[PDB]
Design a protein around this ligand. Structure first.
Ligand SMILES: *[C@@H]1O[C@H](CO)[C@@H](O[C@@H]2O[C@H](CO)[C@@H](O[C@@H]3O[C@H](CO)[C@@H](O)[C@H](O)[C@@H]3O)[C@H](O)[C@H]2NC(C)=O)[C@H](O)[C@H]1NC(C)=O
Lengths: 194, 99, 49
């Protein structure tokens, strides 16, 4: 939610010379409920009159504050759904049998490539904000999961020939416990950012 | 069904093609807060590609163990998937061209 | 405060340098970590038979 204000002051006259108020004091601002923003939605607006104190006196001031709550369905549909489904698609390599080396490599490495492409195209589509954001944290999480899945395949392939039993046990454990960790990650993230 | 690497690369890079198409397709739309008709179409097609890959995964998992089942689901999908995509297209176009 | 000499005369100049330091947290998780993970993934290829 972005609290965007408009501050109205008097330049040269102090409260000893000029006084400010809203005419009506609650209906002074109209036309706000009829504003249809493309990306936000005005959830509330406040009117605040006051006298601010500076060195040479106190100057009057009014303040019109909107609270803009950003609409989410777009960002879900465009950014999260692709990343979540690519993470699941990366998981798909676990049901693919151990011998299918080329198959599981293709799946995992192409999922890494797709995650990189999504990240580096949302980096352009999204506004250029050079500090870290929740969307970036989620994309990093999905990337790290794809990375872990491909490393798990690499481990399975390395340790297979010496012990198929442990290879298969690792495969089944990862099959059962990456969806678990992903749900846990999703829960923590969505409850921390809401 | 026995060409696992070819079918796997096929499906996964089809998904990557769909991802690129979706990303390029949304660079034209103004940043609305909700789904446009083209957004529904793209999401449905993307889900179809994901489901085709999942179908192949099921087929591969049940092949060599229940080959009857693997071939049965393949023959069923060949007639289900296009027969469902076509009707989806018909309904979508009919609803949107008439408004 | 300083004095600048130009072809027209000597002028008083009042300077104020503002000191800025760039944040790193964005490039860390947006370029450095993806690059490091890509290199790690490339090396992990050695473990395959
Ligand atoms: C956006 O942020 C501004 C800045 O905080 C919010 O303004 C704040 O609003 C509250 C509630 O009206 C003000 O509290 C009031 O303080 C006066 C002190 O004279 C008191 O008489 C009232 O009973 C109440 O306690 C607060 O002063 C005010 N802050 C500033 C700096 O003006 C604004 O409400 C936010 N926009 C929203 C919530 O839509």
């Amino acid at each position: 939610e972005q609290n965007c204000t408009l501050e109205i002051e008097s330049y040269g006259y102090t409260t000893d010379d000029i006084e400010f108020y809203w005419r009506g004091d609650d209906n002074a601002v109209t036309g706000v409920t009829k504003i249809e923003l493309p990306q936000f939605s005005i959830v509330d607006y406040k009117l605040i009159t006051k006298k601010v104190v500076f060195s040479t006196g106190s100057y009057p001031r009014l303040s019109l504050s909107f609270k803009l709550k950003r609409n989410i369905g777009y960002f879900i549909l465009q950014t999260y759904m692709p990343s979540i489904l690519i993470t699941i698609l990366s998981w798909v390599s676990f049901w693919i049998n151990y011998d299918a080396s080329a198959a599981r490599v293709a799946l995992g490495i192409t999922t890494v490539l797709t995650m990189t492409t999504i990240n580096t195209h949302l980096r352009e589509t999204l506004p250029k904000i050079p500090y870290v954001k929740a969307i970036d944290m989620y994309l990093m999480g999905c990337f790290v999961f794809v990375f872990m899945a491909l490393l798990e395949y690499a481990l399975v392939n390395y340790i297979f020939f010496s012990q198929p039993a442990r290879a298969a046990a690792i495969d089944r454990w990862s099959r059962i416990f990456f969806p678990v960790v992903f749900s846990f990650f999703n829960i923590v993230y969505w409850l921390y950012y809401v | 069904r026995e060409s696992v690497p070819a079918r796997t690369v096929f499906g996964v890079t089809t998904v990557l093609t769909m991802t690129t198409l979706s990303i390029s397709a949304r660079n034209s739309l103004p940043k609305v807060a909700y789904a446009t008709a083209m957004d529904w179409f793209i999401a449905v097609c993307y889900a179809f590609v994901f489901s085709a890959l999942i179908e192949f995964a099921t087929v591969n998992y049940f092949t060599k163990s229940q080959p009857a089942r693997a071939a049965k689901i393949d023959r069923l999908s060949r007639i289900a998937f296009p027969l469902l995509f076509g009707i989806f297209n018909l309904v979508y176009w009919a609803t949107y061209l008439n408004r | 405060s300083g004095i600048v000499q130009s072809s027209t005369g000597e002028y008083v100049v009042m300077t104020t340098h503002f000191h800025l330091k760039r944040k790193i947290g964005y490039f860390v998780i947006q370029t450095y970590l993806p690059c490091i993970m890509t290199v790690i993934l490339s090396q992990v290829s050695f473990w395959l038979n």
